[PDB]
């Protein structure tokens, strides 16, 4: 799960005599495999509808590849998480090349800054900020500057040898 | 922006009806002095003030119909106000400049000239002597009142007035500077 995978999961109640063709609820789920994606789908239908895995069926599961995985996209993510003392709604912005790598960045950032796990995080929405000046966070907006050029000072070079004979520099 | 909504309409409501505008300065004069200018002139001339960029944005949003208000565009500068009148210039000038001497000098201001106290009978009770004694002013009692011995200068030119040494100036009622309503510009069509 070095990469997340985004799946669409379509499920429904079992058809009955009184109610045939149930309503075919569909969700977009981020998971590492189809087993977790189906598990997260039934977890959210337990939060939304009177249905479970025994009273419902999975009619389709498909992997959604990213439409343009080679372009850089500003993302707005709406997320709900549990802290140690309550539940909080949070909006974050990630400048990233795909949706699954932005969800990876969000989970890494949420665990780093709030000590919140995958167990305790609900992804409410991942959307593309299609134009500039709808970007709200300064840490994403600072990369939207025209012809952005920055250096990387203090380059640290990893040697394959225990001993060095040169007193290495950190030029760059 | 609600107060600006009526202020812009009132500003055009005085630009289009009053034929003479008079740009007047305001530096050290009080609300009391604006109140007495109101009471000295109700009906002859109108004082509209509240200098801001409200005025500049209003007049440059009114240059659509009259391009003769662009002369006023550079002149809105300094703590300033407008006077809307129809009466002659050398009469409205005289009525708004005739009232100069306002409330006495405030402690901690820079007195331009040198302030000095003369060797003449002051005219208050001899109990108010520690004010003269604090500055070193020589003092004798004549006919039961303070008379000064010599013409001593209490502060020199280009110096701040002290908080301790503005008290005998307040008692003696010498205030070399408060100034009145000065004017900066005249507007005619």
């Amino acid at each position: 799960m070095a990469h997340f995978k985004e799946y669409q999961v379509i499920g429904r109640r079992l058809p009955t005599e009184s109610v045939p063709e149930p309503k075919l609820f569909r969700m977009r789920i981020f998971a590492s495999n189809e087993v977790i994606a189906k598990s997260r789908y039934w977890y959210f239908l337990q939060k939304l509808h009177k249905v479970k895995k025994a009273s419902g069926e999975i009619v389709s599961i498909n992997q959604i590849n990213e439409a343009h995985p080679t372009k850089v996209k500003n993302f707005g993510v709406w997320v709900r998480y549990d802290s140690r003392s309550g539940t909080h709604n949070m909006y974050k912005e990630i400048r990233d090349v795909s949706r699954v790598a932005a969800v990876e960045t969000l989970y890494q950032d949420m665990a780093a800054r709030h000590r919140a796990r995958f167990r305790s995080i609900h992804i409410l929405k991942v959307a593309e900020i299609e134009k500039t000046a709808d970007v709200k966070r300064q840490y994403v907006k600072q990369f939207l500057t025209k012809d952005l050029k920055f250096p990387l000072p203090h380059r640290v070079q990893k040697s394959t040898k225990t001993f060095s004979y040169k007193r290495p520099s950190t030029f760059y | 922006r609600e107060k600006k909504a009526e202020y812009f309409a009132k500003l055009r409501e005085y630009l289009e009806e009053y034929k003479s505008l008079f740009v007047v300065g305001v530096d050290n004069v009080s609300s009391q002095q604006m109140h007495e200018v109101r009471k000295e002139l109700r009906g002859r001339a109108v004082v509209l003030m509240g200098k801001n960029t409200m005025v500049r944005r209003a007049i440059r949003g009114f240059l659509s119909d009259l391009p003769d208000f662009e002369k006023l565009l550079p002149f809105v500068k300094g703590n300033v106000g407008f006077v809307f009148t129809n009466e002659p210039l050398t009469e409205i000038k005289n009525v708004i400049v005739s009232n100069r001497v306002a409330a006495p000098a405030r402690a901690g201001a820079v007195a331009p000239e040198d302030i000095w106290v003369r060797a003449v009978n002051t005219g208050m009770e001899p109990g108010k002597t520690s004010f003269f004694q604090a500055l070193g002013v020589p003092t004798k009692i004549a006919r039961g009142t303070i008379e000064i011995v010599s013409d001593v200068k209490v502060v020199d030119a280009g110096n701040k007035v002290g908080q301790s040494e503005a008290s005998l100036l307040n008692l003696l009622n010498i205030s070399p500077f408060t100034f009145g309503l000065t004017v900066v510009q005249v507007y005619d069509n």
């Binding site: 080679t70 372009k71 850089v72 400048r95 990233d96 090349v97 790598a101 990369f143 012809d147 952005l148 050029k149 920055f150 250096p151 990387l152 000072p153 760059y172 | -």
Partner: protein, 136 residues
């Protein structure tokens, strides 16, 4: 009588900066920076060397002193045509960095007969150099 400030020139993470990929599947190929994801992540495109258009970490990539004109977000065809217009591969091969890379791979490609020949030729050159040291 003059202000003297040391400029301390640095390689910049910029659009059009040619980079060498030192870790991964490419591992010594050349790519160009097309976008900047964040402080440590960029987007690279190496179509002349066969590098895929990918978002990469700047840690596993070393910047080269070469740069060329490239618009922001240029696609693979645009990156290919402006790479050949700027002639990046010739300017890369002229550098002593790439000369040293080619020298160390030729030394690793030397066989035992060739290492005997280079030792014989090193002795032949050494005799002339030591002779010229004594004359000078």
């Amino acid at each position: 009588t003059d202000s003297i400030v040391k400029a301390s020139n640095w390689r910049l993470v910029e659009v059009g900066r040619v980079v060498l990929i030192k870790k991964g599947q490419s591992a010594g190929k050349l790519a160009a920076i097309v976008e900047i994801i964040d402080q440590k992540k960029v987007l690279i495109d190496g179509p002349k060397a066969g590098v895929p258009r990918q978002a990469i970490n700047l840690g596993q990539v070393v910047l080269t002193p070469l740069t060329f004109a490239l618009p922001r977000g240029a696609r693979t065809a645009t990156v290919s045509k402006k790479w050949a217009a700027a002639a990046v591969c010739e300017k890369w091969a002229a550098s002593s960095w790439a000369k040293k890379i080619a020298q160390r791979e030729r030394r690793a490609a030397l066989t035992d007969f060739e290492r005997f020949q280079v030792m014989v030729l090193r002795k032949q050159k050494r005799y002339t150099v030591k002779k010229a040291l004594a004359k000078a």
